[PDB]
Amino acid sequence: AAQTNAPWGLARISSTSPGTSTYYYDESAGQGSCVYVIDTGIEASHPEFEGRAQMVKTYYYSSRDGNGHGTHCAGTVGSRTYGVAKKTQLFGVKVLDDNGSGQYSTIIAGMDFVASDKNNRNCPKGVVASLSLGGGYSSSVNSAAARLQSSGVMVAVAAGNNNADARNYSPASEPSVCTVGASDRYDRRSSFSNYGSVLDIFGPGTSILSTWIGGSTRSISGTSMATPHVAGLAAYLMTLGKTTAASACRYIADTANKGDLSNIPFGTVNLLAYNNYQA
């Protein structure tokens, strides 16, 4: 399949080269997979989600995305126009309030929620969690992300936007999950992207167009926006049978575009997510 005039990040994940604008992907498109978007919620009624998005959990008075960040991430995972995996199911877990903040105990509970809730969903092709969130180092948050991964969910988490080593951030510093840095359309490390030996992969993170609340769209930047590309890519690859939840991050790093990013600090992987689709 070919999506002409796609967002640059979708076109990048299906290209050996920057600077193209067509997204190529197998038409299975993550059908039969599931992605939990653990964030500020999802505007499930956005026409871009086509009935495939639903709120499954909130820790606040409403499940409704009052921020836009969770909607934007869910759109990069699986919306028809802005999404990597255009047929996946999206499950919203609102662990962040509408200023995008969340206590870490709520974030931990939401992660444990997903590890159990996936047994209430039909995801024959496998389960992904996208965690476009983070703060300071927490061994309890790392361990929650590790449990989720251990439970058979691919966990993809943002490296953080501190332009620092991600060792000092959670859940970015949890080694068993897939820690995602951000690159820009010129294959530069995004100026804000964390780095370090705990990063597993880079995805498009600068000026990423996706769904926004109020049925709108907008372009925003962040390792938080790189993560759903990788989450979406995992759901897509799992549906194609190329990998499983336990091995997707490794598989994505094995099949990634290698050595194409600039300003990657010594000791950080130079790997850009790539679906390796041959049309």
Side-chain angles (χ1 to χ4, degrees):
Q3 176 195 345
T4 54
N5 315 111
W8 77 263
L10 301 184
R12 191 73 198 73
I13 62 170
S14 60
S15 181
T16 49
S17 296
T20 66
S21 59
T22 307
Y23 175 38
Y24 304 105
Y25 61 95
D26 184 276
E27 67 172 68
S28 61
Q31 169 82 42
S33 71
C34 299
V35 185
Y36 286 83
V37 179
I38 309 180
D39 199 79
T40 65
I42 306 173
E43 191 169 72
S45 67
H46 198 305
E48 280 285 311
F49 295 126
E50 311 169 296
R52 288 177 293 99
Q54 63 179 323
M55 289 317 290
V56 301
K57 181 64 175 179
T58 182
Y59 298 89
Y60 305 92
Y61 52 84
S62 183
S63 80
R64 192 276 308 281
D65 180 10
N67 184 274
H69 184 101
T71 291
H72 190 280
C73 302
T76 295
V77 174
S79 68
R80 67 197 179 183
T81 307
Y82 310 101
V84 169
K86 296 173 191 296
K87 295 303 217 213
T88 198
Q89 288 293 135
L90 303 153
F91 301 126
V93 176
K94 178 167 174 65
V95 300
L96 302 181
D97 68 26
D98 291 335
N99 292 114
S101 73
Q103 288 291 306
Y104 294 209
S105 53
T106 297
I107 289 166
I108 286 162
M111 274 188 232
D112 289 293
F113 173 81
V114 175
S116 182
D117 183 66
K118 67 175 202 294
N119 298 311
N120 294 321
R121 308 300 163 184
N122 285 302
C123 312
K125 296 307 187 178
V127 185
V128 182
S130 190
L131 286 58
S132 303
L133 58 80
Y137 180 84
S138 165
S139 49
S140 54
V141 169
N142 283 13
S143 56
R147 290 196 297 282
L148 186 55
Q149 181 69 48
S150 179
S151 78
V153 172
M154 182 171 173
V155 183
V157 311
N161 305 307
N162 314 97
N163 184 32
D165 194 306
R167 54 174 61 168
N168 288 325
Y169 298 93
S170 285
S173 49
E174 172 44 50
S176 62
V177 309
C178 195
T179 300
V180 188
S183 66
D184 72 7
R185 72 180 68 249
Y186 301 108
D187 277 359
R188 304 186 285 232
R189 183 173 60 92
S190 300
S191 67
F192 52 75
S193 181
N194 279 356
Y195 50 80
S197 68
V198 73
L199 274 71
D200 299 297
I201 192 67
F202 284 81
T206 303
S207 298
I208 304 303
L209 176 65
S210 185
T211 46
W212 196 256
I213 51 174
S216 66
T217 60
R218 68 178 61 176
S219 182
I220 62 167
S221 293
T223 53
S224 160
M225 297 301 102
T227 307
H229 284 90
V230 171
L233 176 53
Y236 166 90
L237 291 174
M238 294 176 71
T239 288
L240 282 171
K242 292 220 189 261
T243 190
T244 50
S247 289
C249 195
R250 192 184 289 221
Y251 179 86
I252 283 153
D254 292 352
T255 56
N257 280 314
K258 296 182 191 283
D260 314 303
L261 298 172
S262 75
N263 196 25
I264 298 295
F266 204 77
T268 296
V269 297
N270 195 324
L271 300 171
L272 182 66
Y274 171 52
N275 72 3
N276 186 69
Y277 175 69
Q278 301 291 65

